[PDB]
Amino acid sequence: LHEDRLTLANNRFAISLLHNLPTSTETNIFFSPYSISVALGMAFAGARGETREDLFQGFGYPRSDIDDDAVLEAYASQTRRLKSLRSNSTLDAAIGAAIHERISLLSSFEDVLNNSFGADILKVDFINGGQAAVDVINGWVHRKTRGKINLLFGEPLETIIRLVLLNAIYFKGTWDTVFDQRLTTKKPFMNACSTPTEVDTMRGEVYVRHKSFPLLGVDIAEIPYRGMDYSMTILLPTRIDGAEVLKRNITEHLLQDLVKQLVEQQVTVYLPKFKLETEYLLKDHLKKLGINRIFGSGADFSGITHDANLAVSDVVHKTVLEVHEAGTEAAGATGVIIVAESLVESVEFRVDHPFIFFIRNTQTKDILFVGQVNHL
Ligand code: NI
């Protein structure tokens, strides 16, 4: 029951992280608060005492009415729910703890990583097997994401590292209404550096949930995937330069109030065929949110090992997305609806300047992906 609780904690975490991640006119943001949260659950499973209480507080489980004795079981229920509701859309996740092979592991940690997180444990030799370790990890992410994410590490890791938390995830899905490839054309997209660039721009008279919010300087359109259980929610600033103010203004509560008011409507969508590929070493950003002890000397990890001084070296996150006429995949759909011109009115939603977006499960309300596009 109260499945909303971990979802709220994760979605609040999503917005905190979006507020704090590095931004520039030249840099795009793209991350899974869902996969990063599962990764912080692995840390929670292993930490005890003040190391665990510090993570508990810093992530904010108690602010969403989750007692610490209920965290692992809330992950377990969210885990079973996402991969047991049958769906046209799929998530391929690489979630694991890479631990020095010569640390003895408590069986309970193994059991919790399995049932709570569907997480793997990669025992590797971080001291002597430097290149073999990254070869193993990189092979693991490659197979877990079915060739979408193929490297977590281009170089051996520092020989000091004993525990590193990995989370890569790929979303696959098809538009409920596929765009007609014959209508895709080169169109200007105004980057955040205020130079226009020419990009493949999809065009469709497409049923979406839409509302204009001129007072908040945002137009919003929710573009559903097939099955209606997933969507891409695009927040397009009224001002060409409005993205940083919009991102600062957005909160988990406000986003929920805005999405509720969207009305089903046929709109002319202009959507660049954009591509994102991002990696984060998240330790410093997590420190800034009050998560510190899990990364420190004298971190209590008597949940993982009764016989070594473990600290988490880092939380390594990597993800990737392409937009196509069919959805996530190039030529992933072969049927199409050729729409007659409307003769009464058609709203335009033209994504031709920096914008923010969320891929959500519309039933559970989980935010799977947060995006900011400053630059194509
Ligand atoms: Ni409200």
Measure 329 CA to ligand 1 centroid, in angstroms.
36
Measure 254 CA to ligand 1 centroid, in angstroms.
7
Distance CA 146, CA 136 (A): 15
Distance CA 42, CA 9 (A): 16
CB within 8 A of 278, min separation 6: which ones? 28, 29, 30, 31, 317, 318, 319, 320
Measure 369 CA to ligand 1 centroid, in angstroms.
22
**φ, ψ of residue 322 in degrees (nearest 5):** -130, 145
Measure 283 CA to ligand 1 centroid, in angstroms.
32
Measure 342 CA to ligand 1 centroid, in angstroms.
35
- Which stretches does DSSP call E strand in 296-353? 315-322, 347-350
**Token pair of 129, please?**
């097997």
CB within 8 A of 227, min separation 6: which ones? 87, 88, 89, 176
State the method. X-ray
Measure 261 CA to ligand 1 centroid, in angstroms.
11
Residue 290 φ/ψ region, left for φ over 0, alpha for ψ in the -120 to 50 degree band, beta for the rest: left
Q: 371, 29 in Cβ contact below 8 A?
A: yes
Distance CA 79, CA 217 (A): 36
Measure 216 CA to ligand 1 centroid, in angstroms.
15
Q: 374, 243 in Cβ contact below 8 A?
A: yes
Compute the radius of gyration of the chain from its Cα atoms.
21
Measure 143 CA to ligand 1 centroid, in angstroms.
43
Q: 149, 279 in Cβ contact below 8 A?
A: no
DSSP 91-134: EEEEEEEEEETTS---HHHHHHHHHHH--EEEEE-TTT-HHHHH
C-alpha pair distances (Å), 182 with each of 304, 348, 376: 56, 19, 22
Measure 37 CA to ligand 1 centroid, in angstroms.
25
Distance CA 10, CA 74 (A): 11
Distance CA 73, CA 197 (A): 48
Under DSSP, the state recorded for 90 is E
Distance CA 189, CA 28 (A): 14
Q: 180, 204 in Cβ contact below 8 A?
A: yes
Measure 15 CA to ligand 1 centroid, in angstroms.
16
Measure 87 CA to ligand 1 centroid, in angstroms.
30
Given in angstroms, what resolution was this structure solved at?
2.3
Measure 285 CA to ligand 1 centroid, in angstroms.
28
Measure 253 CA to ligand 1 centroid, in angstroms.
6
Measure 260 CA to ligand 1 centroid, in angstroms.
10
**φ, ψ of residue 127 in degrees (nearest 5):** -85, -60
Neighbours of 36 (CB within 10 A): 26
Measure 219 CA to ligand 1 centroid, in angstroms.
19
Measure 286 CA to ligand 1 centroid, in angstroms.
27
Under DSSP, the state recorded for 26 is S
Measure 12 CA to ligand 1 centroid, in angstroms.
14
Measure 6 CA to ligand 1 centroid, in angstroms.
19
In the chain, the N- to C-terminal Cα span, in Å, equals 43
Distance CA 290, CA 345 (A): 50
DSSP 184-252: -EEEEEE-TTS-EEEEEEEEEEEEEEEEEETTTTEEEEEEEBTTSSEEEEEEEESSTT-HHHHHHH--H
